[PDB]
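Project standup — Tuesday

K.O.: blocked on the structure for the chain from last sprint. Re-posting the sequence here as requested.
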Amino acid sequence: PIISAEDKHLTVLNLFTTDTPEKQGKLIEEMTKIVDAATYEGWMSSTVHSGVDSHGTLNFIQWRSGEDLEKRYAGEEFKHRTLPVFGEITTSIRLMQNEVAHTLTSDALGGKIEIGPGRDDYTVFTVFPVTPQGQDEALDALGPGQAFLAQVPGFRAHVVLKGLRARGLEGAFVISYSQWDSKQAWEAYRDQAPQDQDEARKAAVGRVRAVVAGEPYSNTYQVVHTRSAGEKLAAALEHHH
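H.V.: unblocked you, prediction finished:
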């Protein structure tokens, strides 16, 4: 699926944490059943991520509008099967509605971003709770503030999302979602010492740090499954519900 700052649809990220690799595998399988059967009006695509640094998963989902999303939330499978099943294999659930604030690619300022299991993107994710006063500052710092990323070795792309509203998370929030050549390229950047960090990096980070209002959540992922509206694709033959 394709991500761009001109997106007029709703970007939904469903974030799940868990405490064993067995529950992670189970999460992946349950998410994938829902994706493969997805026919909701307005549903555009889902991209399932499997946690690497720590146990959990992430679904990056595109919806035509919030109205379409709410219809799904009002469905009986979601209410009586999905939530309770997920509840039992997770330590937390955050269903976050966002708009795309900024994109950057290694080759173009504001370039379009593609996500999918075929790219082998090492995917890096952070949700920052921020002060309501400081939200725009955070967005500016993370997006335009980090133009330097495009020249970092192994960096592929960066999406910055503005949090609109969420289930399981209160207050203002923003999200950083980036793609890298490998775990190795990411950690080399992540772990730069002060002497090796760009000063523009220090400035961006310092601006975000000033307005963070609580513990951010970060994790890394492999993309393991993606499907779009009407796409003839599934990890299993039989419909589950």
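K.O.: great, moving the ticket to review. The chain is about 30% helix and 35% strand. The first strand starts at residue 2 and ends at 3.
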